[PDB]
Amino acid sequence: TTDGVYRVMTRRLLGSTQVGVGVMQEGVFHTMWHVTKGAALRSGEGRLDPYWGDVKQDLVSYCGPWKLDAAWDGLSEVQLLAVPPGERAKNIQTLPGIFKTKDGDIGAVALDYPAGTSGSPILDKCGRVIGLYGNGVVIKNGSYVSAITQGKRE
Amino acid sequence: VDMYIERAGDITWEKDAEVTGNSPRLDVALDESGDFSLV
Numbered sequence: 001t002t003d004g005v006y007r008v009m010t011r012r013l014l015g016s017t018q019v020g021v022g023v024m025q026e027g028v029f030h031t032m033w034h035v036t037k038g039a040a041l042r043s044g045e046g047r048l049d050p051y052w053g054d055v056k057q058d059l060v061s062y063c064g065p066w067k068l069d070a071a072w073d074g075l076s077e078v079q080l081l082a083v084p085p086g087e088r089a090k091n092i093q094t095l096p097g098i099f100k101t102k103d104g105d106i107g108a109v110a111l112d113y114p115a116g117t118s119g120s121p122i123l124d125k126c127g128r129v130i131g132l133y134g135n136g137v138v139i140k141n142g143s144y145v146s147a148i149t150q151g152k153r154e
Numbered sequence: 155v156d157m158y159i160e161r162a163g164d165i166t167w168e169k170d171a172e173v174t175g176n177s178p179r180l181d182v183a184l185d186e187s188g189d190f191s192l193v
């Protein structure tokens with residue numbers, strides 16, 4: 001459980017598929033629910049058990065409660081640290097747009113990556129994780145916009 | 155199914171990074187299952 005960004009992989013009898021990405025911080029693994037469906041993970045020889053999650057937020061944490069507390073400031077540019085299948089991590093800077101909902105505004109990034117990039121962290125300028133990439137919408141021309149999805153550190 | 159994790163890098167902001175993408179203003183609904191849909 002060393003700090004960093006990780007690929008989430010599945011394999012059966014043949015090769016592996018990258019289904020997503022997540023963040024290890026403070027001994028807890030953080031990813032999107034749709035990546036793991038809330039099931040247990042292997043890390044080397046160890047097992048990581050689901051601890052907290054919420055399907056409406058599309059989030060799940062392993063080993064402990066959600067630790068990522070930084071918030072988008074509602075103003076500044078951010079970076080997606082994209083970890084696409086078969087490619088090394090890369091930083092993409094963008095000025096978020098906004099998902100306007102009946103319950104308030106959520107920052108959203110107009111950046112389009114493969115499905116298995118889900119869970120890649122979005123960063124503020126201090127390198128803090130302000131949310132995870134990959135729960136979004138497809139707009140009229142077929143391009144993609146992802147919410148900056150962040151949980152609550154209780 | 156063996157679902158497992160593999161380390162892929164450090165989490166660091168990149169100075170002088172490539173900037174891209176617009177800043178769309180979208181009306182969306184979030185359902186109880188976690189689906190976002192355009193209104």
Ligand SMILES: CCCC[C@@H]1NC(=O)[C@H](CCCCN)NC(=O)Cc2cccc(c2)CNC(=O)CNC(=O)[C@H](NC(=N)N)CCCCNC1=O
Pocket residue numbers: 034112113114115116117118133134135136137138142143144189190191192
């Ligand atoms: C429950 C599981 C959620 C899974 C989640 N999908 C999403 O948020 C959206 C939600 C749409 C609104 C729902 N109310 N789901 C899609 O985008 C599906 C989709 C739709 C049209 C076409 C394609 C894929 C083909 N694209 C790819 O095969 C790779 N790219 C893509 O798949 C998307 N880009 C694109 N231009 N369509 C980028 C996906 C980024 C990671 N997130 C996801 O995979």
